[PDB]
Ligand binder design. Structure first.
Ligand SMILES: O[C@H]1[C@H](O)[C@@H](O)[C@H](O)[C@@H](O)[C@H]1O
Length: 306
C-alpha cells in the first residue's frame, strides 16, 4: 500500500505511465510554510510543512508563485507578500530530494504573483529562463526532453516545468510554448496546451463558498474517473481564498474539504483522479481521511509476477 511509504510512491508505479495519467497530490502556494504571524497566516498561509517535508509526505506537484525583485532573482510570494526566500531554495530542496529518491519526478508550476521591482528590466519569464532553467547550477535538474506528454521513465529524477508564466521560449514541460496557458479566472475551464497536443482541464474556482467548491471539485473528479484519455491533464484545486470578512482561515477550510474529498476518493476505489492541489498537504486530523494518502492510494498497481 503506497501511502505507507509516501517518500518513494512513484518509484512503485509502472514507468510507462504518462505523468498526466498518475494521480498526484500537489500543494497550493507551496512556499507559504515560512509565515508565523498569526493574523496574516489566517489568509496568506496555506502550508505548515517545508518543501522537503512536503516531498517526504508524497507531494509531487508544487505551486510556486514568484516575484522578480532584481534582474537575477525570483522571490517566492503570496501576491504582494514576500515568503522570505528565493526560488533557489526550492530548486536545491527538490535536487536533494530527487537525488535521495531518484525514481520520483516533481512537477513545478511557476507563476508570476506580483509586479517586479521598478529597477527590474527583464520580464519574469526571461529571468526564470536565463537565471534558473538555463543556470548551469541546475544542469541535470529539469526535464529537457521533447515529449509534450512525457512518461515517468522519461522524467525520473527531474523537475518538469508546468508553465503559468505566459508565452515562453522554454521547449520542455506543460505549456512550454510561445503561447503559454490561457488561465481563466475563478473558474472550471479547458484550454489546449503544448501546440495543441494536450487538453488541460482546470477547476480553479478559488472564490467559492464551501458547498459550491465541493461540487466543483467533485464535478472534475467525476469527469476524471470516466476519462482514460492520456492527452487530457486534470488540475483540481481544493484550495480557496480565506477572505478578510468571511473569516474562515485557509486552514479551517482545508479541514472540511480535504477530508470530504479524501472520503469520496476512498469510496471510488482505484480510479483516475487527476492532479489534486491542496492546502495543508500532509496535515492530519485524527478520525478524518487524509487527502494526500488517498490521492496516492487511488493509483492502480497492476500485478505482475516476480
Ligand atoms: O489567488 C488565486 C489562487 O491562488 C488560485 O489557485 C490561482 O490560480 C489564481 O491565479 C490566484 O489568483
Amino acid at each position: 500500500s503506497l501511502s505507507k511509504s509516501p517518500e518513494n510512491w512513484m518509484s512503485k508505479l509502472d514507468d510507462g505511465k504518462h505523468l498526466t495519467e498518475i494521480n498526484i497530490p500537489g500543494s497550493h502556494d507551496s512556499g507559504s510554510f515560512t509565515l508565523k504571524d498569526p493574523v496574516k497566516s489566517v489568509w496568506a498561509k496555506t502550508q505548515d510543512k517545508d518543501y522537503l517535508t512536503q516531498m517526504k509526505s508524497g507531494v509531487r506537484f508544487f505551486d510556486i508563485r514568484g516575484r522578480a525583485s532584481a534582474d537575477n532573482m525570483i522571490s517566492v510570494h503570496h501576491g504582494m507578500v514576500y515568503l522570505h526566500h528565493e526560488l533557489g531554495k526550492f530548486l536545491d530542496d527538490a535536487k536533494y530530494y530527487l537525488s535521495a529518491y531518484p525514481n520520483e519526478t516533481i512537477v513545478m508550476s511557476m507563476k508570476k504573483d506580483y509586479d517586479s521591482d521598478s529597477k527590474v528590466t527583464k520580464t519574469f519569464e526571461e529571468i526564470f529562463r536565463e537565471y534558473y532553467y538555463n543556470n548551469p547550477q541546475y544542469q541535470n535538474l529539469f526535464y529537457t526532453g521533447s515529449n509534450a506528454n512525457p512518461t515517468l521513465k522519461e522524467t525520473k529524477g527531474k523537475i518538469v516545468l508546468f508553465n503559468r508564466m505566459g508565452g515562453t521560449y522554454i521547449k520542455s514541460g506543460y505549456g512550454a510554448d510561445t503561447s503559454g496557458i490561457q488561465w481563466a479566472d475563478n473558474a472550471t475551464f479547458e484550454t489546449k496546451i503544448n501546440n495543441g497536443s494536450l487538453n488541460l482541464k482546470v477547476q480553479d474556482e478559488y472564490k467559492d463558498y464551501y458547498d459550491k467548491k465541493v461540487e466543483a471539485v467533485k464535478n472534475l473528479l467525476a469527469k476524471a474517473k470516466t476519462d482514460s484519455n492520456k492527452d487530457n491533464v486534470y488540475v483540481n484545486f481544493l484550495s480557496v481564498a480565506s477572505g478578510g470578512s468571511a473569516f474562515n482561515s485557509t486552514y479551517n477550510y482545508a479541514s472540511y474539504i480535504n477530508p470530504e474529498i479524501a472520503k469520496t476518493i476512498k469510496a471510488n476505489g482505484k480510479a483516475r483522479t487527476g492532479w489534486l492541489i491542496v492546502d495543508y498537504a500532509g496535515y492530519t486530523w485524527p478520525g478524518y481521511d487524509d487527502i494526500v494518502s488517498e490521492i496516492i492510494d487511488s493509483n492502480k498497481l497492476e500485478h505482475h509476477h516476480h
